[PDB]
Amino acid sequence: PAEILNGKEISAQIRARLKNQVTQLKEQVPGFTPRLAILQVGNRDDSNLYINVKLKAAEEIGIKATHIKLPRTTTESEVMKYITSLNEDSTVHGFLVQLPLDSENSINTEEVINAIAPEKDVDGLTSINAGRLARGDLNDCFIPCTPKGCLELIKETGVPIAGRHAVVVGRSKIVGAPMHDLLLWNNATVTTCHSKTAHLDEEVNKGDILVVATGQPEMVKGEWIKPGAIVIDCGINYVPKVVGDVAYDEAKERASFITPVPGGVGPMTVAMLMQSTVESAKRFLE
Amino acid sequence: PAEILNGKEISAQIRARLKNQVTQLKEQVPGFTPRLAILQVGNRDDSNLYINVKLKAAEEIGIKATHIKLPRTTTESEVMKYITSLNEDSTVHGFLVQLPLDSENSINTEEVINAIAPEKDVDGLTSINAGRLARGDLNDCFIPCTPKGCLELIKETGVPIAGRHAVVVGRSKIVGAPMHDLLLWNNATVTTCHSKTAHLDEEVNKGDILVVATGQPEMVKGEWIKPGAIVIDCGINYVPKVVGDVAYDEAKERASFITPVPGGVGPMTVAMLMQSTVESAKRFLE
Numbered sequence: 001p002a003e004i005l006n007g008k009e010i011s012a013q014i015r016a017r018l019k020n021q022v023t024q025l026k027e028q029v030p031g032f033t034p035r036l037a038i039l040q041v042g043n044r045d046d047s048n049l050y051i052n053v054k055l056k057a058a059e060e061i062g063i064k065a066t067h068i069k070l071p072r073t074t075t076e077s078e079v080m081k082y083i084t085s086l087n088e089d090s091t092v093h094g095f096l097v098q099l100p101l102d103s104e105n106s107i108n109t110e111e112v113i114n115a116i117a118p119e120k121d122v123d124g125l126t127s128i129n130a131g132r133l134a135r136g137d138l139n140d141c142f143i144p145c146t147p148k149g150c151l152e153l154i155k156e157t158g159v160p161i162a163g164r165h166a167v168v169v170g171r172s173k174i175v176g177a178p179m180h181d182l183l184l185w186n187n188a189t190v191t192t193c194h195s196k197t198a199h200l201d202e203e204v205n206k207g208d209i210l211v212v213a214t215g216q217p218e219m220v221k222g223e224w225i226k227p228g229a230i231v232i233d234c235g236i237n238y239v240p241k242v243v244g245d246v247a248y249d250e251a252k253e254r255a256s257f258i259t260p261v262p263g264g265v266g267p268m269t270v271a272m273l274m275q276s277t278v279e280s281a282k283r284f285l286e
Numbered sequence: 287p288a289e290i291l292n293g294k295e296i297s298a299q300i301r302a303r304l305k306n307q308v309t310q311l312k313e314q315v316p317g318f319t320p321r322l323a324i325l326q327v328g329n330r331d332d333s334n335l336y337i338n339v340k341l342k343a344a345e346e347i348g349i350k351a352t353h354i355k356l357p358r359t360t361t362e363s364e365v366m367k368y369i370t371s372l373n374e375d376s377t378v379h380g381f382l383v384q385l386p387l388d389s390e391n392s393i394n395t396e397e398v399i400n401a402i403a404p405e406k407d408v409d410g411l412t413s414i415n416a417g418r419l420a421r422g423d424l425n426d427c428f429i430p431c432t433p434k435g436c437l438e439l440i441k442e443t444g445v446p447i448a449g450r451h452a453v454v455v456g457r458s459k460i461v462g463a464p465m466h467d468l469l470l471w472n473n474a475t476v477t478t479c480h481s482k483t484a485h486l487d488e489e490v491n492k493g494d495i496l497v498v499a500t501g502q503p504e505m506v507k508g509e510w511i512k513p514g515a516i517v518i519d520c521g522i523n524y525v526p527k528v529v530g531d532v533a534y535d536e537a538k539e540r541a542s543f544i545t546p547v548p549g550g551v552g553p554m555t556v557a558m559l560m561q562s563t564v565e566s567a568k569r570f571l572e
C-alpha cells in the first residue's frame with residue numbers, strides 16, 4: 001500500500017507560514033494588508049463552496065478577501081467594468097474570476113480573463129502568464145493554483161522529478177495544460193492525454209508520475225497505474241459522497257504515493273492561491 | 287520504404303497562392319501591399335543566410351521586406367527604440383527579430399521579444415501569442431512558422447492527426463514547445479522530450495508522428511523509429527555537408543513518410559512566415 005499524501009495537513013503548514021509572513025509584513029509596514037478580490041458570475045452551488053473556502057483561508061492568514069457575486073443575467077460589458085475598476089484600484093493586489101461563468105447571456109470567457117492585468121493575475125489565467133509558463137519563463141509569472149499545489153505534493157515524496165515520465169490526463173486551461181508545462185520545465189518527460197486519446201489505459205501505465213484532471217468520477221482504474229507510481233488526483237466529483245477521478249481503493253494498491261479525495265489537491269489549491277496573493281502583495285511594496 | 291515529403295515542391299505551391307492572393311488584393315485595393323520588417327542584431331553567418339532566404343521569398347510573392355541590421359555592440363535600449371518605431375509605423379503589417387541576438391552587451395531577449403505588438407508578431411514569439419496557442423485559443427494568434435510548416439507537412443500524408451501518438455523531441459521556444467501545442471490541439475497524444483529525458487530511443491519508438499528539433503546531427507537513429515511513423519526533421523547541421531537531426535538512411539527504411547534534409551522543413555518555414563505576413567496585412571485592411 002501507498003503512503004497517502006496529506007493535503008489537508010501539508011496545506012495547514014503552508015497557511016501557518018503565510019500567516020506569520022503576513023504578520024511580519026504588517027509589523028514591517030504599518031497599515032498595509034494584502035487585498036484579494038474574487039469575482040463570481042451567477043450562482044453555481046459548487047462555485048459558492050470553493051469561493052467561500054477561499055474566503056476562510058484568507059481570513060485565517062490575514063489577507064483581506066472581498067467577494068463580488070454578479071447575477072446570472074449580467075452582460076459581458078458589466079463584467080468588464082468590474083475588472084476595469086479592480087485593475088486600477090491600487091489597493092487590490094490581486095483578483096480572479098471564478099470559472100466557469102454562469103451567465104444566461106453569451107460572454108467571451110477568454111476576453112474577460114485576458115482583461116485582467118497580469119501583475120494581479122493570481123490565478124495565472126491570462127495568455128500573458130500562460131505564455132511565459134508555456135515557454136519555461138517560470139520566475140516572472142503567476143502559475144495556476146491547482147498545478148502549483150500538485151507539484152508541491154510531488155516534491156513531498158522526495159522522489160526527484162527530473163528524468164521521470166509524467167502522464168497528465170486532461171488539458172484544461174486552469175489545470176491540465178499548465179500542469180504539463182510545470183512538469184516539463186521540472187525536467188520530466190511529459191505525455192499529455194485527453195478525450196481523443198486511444199488506448200488511454202496503456203498510456204496511463206507509462207506514468208512514473210500521474211496527474212488526472214478529467215472530471216470523470218473514478219474513470220482511471222487502478223490496474224492502469226504503473227506499479228510504484230506517484231498518483232495525483234485533482235478530481236472532485238459528487239456521486240451517490242465525493243470521489244476523485246481515480247478509483248482510489250485499487251490505485252492505492254499499486255501507487256507508491258497517492259492523494260485521497262477529498263483532502264488532497266483541493267486544500268493545496270487554496271493554499272497556493274494564498275501564497276500567490278502574498279507574493280503579489282510583496283511585489284507591490286517593492 | 288517511405289514517401290518523401292517534398293518541402294521544395296510543397297512550399298512552391300503555397301508561395302504561388304500567396305502571390306496570386308497578393309495580386310488580387312492589389313487589384314481590389316489599389317496601391318496597398320503587405321510590408322514585412324526583419325530586425326537583426328550582430329552579423330551571424332547563419333542568420334544572414336536565413337534572412338536572405340526570407341527576403342527572396344517575400345520578393346517572389348509581392349511582400350515588401352525591409353532588413354535592418356544593428357551592430358554587435360548595440361544596447362538593449364537601442365533595439366527597444368527600433369521595435370517601438372516598427373510597432374508605431376502603420377505601413378508595417380508584421381515584423382520579426384531574427385534570433386539569437388549577437389551582442390557584446392548582455393541583452394534581454396525576452397524583454398526585446400515581448401515589446402513587439404502582438405498584432406504584428408508574425409513569428410509567434412510574443413508571450414501573448416505563445417499563451418493563446420498553449421491553451422487552444424487558436425483563432426487569434428500567430429502560430430510560429432516552423433511548427434506551422436511541420437503541421438502542413440504532416441497534413442500532406444492524408445493521415446489524420448487525431449488519436450495518434452506524437453513524439454516531439456526538443457522544447458525550444460521557436461520549434462519544440464510550440465510544436466507540442468499545435469499537435470495537441472490537433473488532438474494527438476503528445477510526448478515532449480528534451481535532455482533530462484531518459485531512454486529517448488523508447489520514447490521515440492512510440493511516435494506515430496515524430497518531430498525532431500534538437501540541433502544534434504543525426505542523433506535520432508533510424509533503428510528507434512516506429513515502423514510506419516511519419517518523421518519530420520527540423521535539423522540543419524553542418525558536418526564533415528548539411529544533415530538533419532535524424533539518421534536519414536535507416537529512418538527512411540522504416541517511416542511511411544519522411545522529410546529530406548535539406549529541402550524539407552526549411553522552405554516550409556519561410557512560406558509560413560509569408561502566409562502569416564499576408565494574413566496580418568489582410569487583417570489590417572479591415
Ligand SMILES: NC(=O)c1ccc[n+]([C@@H]2O[C@H](COP(=O)([O-])OP(=O)(O)OC[C@H]3O[C@@H](n4cnc5c(N)ncnc54)[C@H](OP(=O)(O)O)[C@@H]3O)[C@@H](O)[C@H]2O)c1
Nearest residue numbers: 099170171172175194195196213214215216234235236245
Ligand atoms: N473547475 C473547477 O471549478 C474545479 C473544481 C474542483 C475540481 N476540479 C477538477 O479539476 C479537473 C479539471 O478541471 P476542469 O473541470 O476545468 O476541466 P474540463 O473543462 O472539465 O476538461 C476535462 C479534461 O479531461 C478530459 N477528459 C474528459 N473525458 C475524458 C476521458 N474519457 N479520457 C480522457 N480525458 C478525458 C477532457 O479532454 P478534452 O480536452 O479532449 O475535452 C478535458 O481536457 C477535474 O478533475 C475537476 O473535477 C475542477
Ligand SMILES: NC(=O)c1ccc[n+]([C@@H]2O[C@H](COP(=O)([O-])OP(=O)(O)OC[C@H]3O[C@@H](n4cnc5c(N)ncnc54)[C@H](OP(=O)(O)O)[C@@H]3O)[C@@H](O)[C@H]2O)c1
Nearest residue numbers: 456457458460461479480481498499500501502520521522
Ligand atoms: N534556430 C534557428 O535559427 C535554426 C536554423 C536552422 C535550423 N534549426 C533547427 O531547428 C531546431 C531548432 O533548435 P533551436 O536552435 O530553436 O533550439 P536549441 O536551443 O538548440 O534547443 C534544442 C532542443 O533540443 C533538446 N536536446 C538537445 N540535445 C538533446 C538530446 N541529446 N536529447 C534530447 N533532446 C535534446 C534540448 O533540450 P533542453 O531544453 O533540455 O536543452 C533543446 O530543448 C534544431 O533542430 C536546429 O538544427 C534552427
Ligand SMILES: Nc1nc(N)c(NC(=O)Nc2ccc(C(=O)N[C@@H](CCc3nnn[nH]3)C(=O)O)cc2)c(=O)[nH]1
Nearest residue numbers: 050053096097098099100123145262263264266267269
Ligand atoms: N478561477 C478559478 N476557477 C475555478 N473553478 C478554480 N478551481 C477551484 O477553485 N478548485 C477547487 C478545488 C477544491 C477545493 C477544495 O476546497 N477541496 C476540498 C474540499 C472539497 C469538498 N467537497 N465537498 N466537501 N468538501 C478537498 O478537496 O479536500 C477548492 C477549490 C480555480 O482554482 N480558479
Ligand SMILES: Nc1nc(N)c(NC(=O)Nc2ccc(C(=O)N[C@@H](CCc3nnn[nH]3)C(=O)O)cc2)c(=O)[nH]1
Nearest residue numbers: 336339382383384385386409528548549550552553555
Ligand atoms: N525570429 C526567428 N528567428 C529564427 N532563428 C528563426 N528560424 C529560422 O528562420 N530558421 C530557418 C531554417 C532554415 C530555413 C531554410 O530556408 N532552409 C532551407 C535551406 C537551408 C539551407 N541553405 N543552405 N544550407 N541549408 C532547407 O533546409 O531546405 C529557413 C529558416 C525564425 O523562423 N524566426
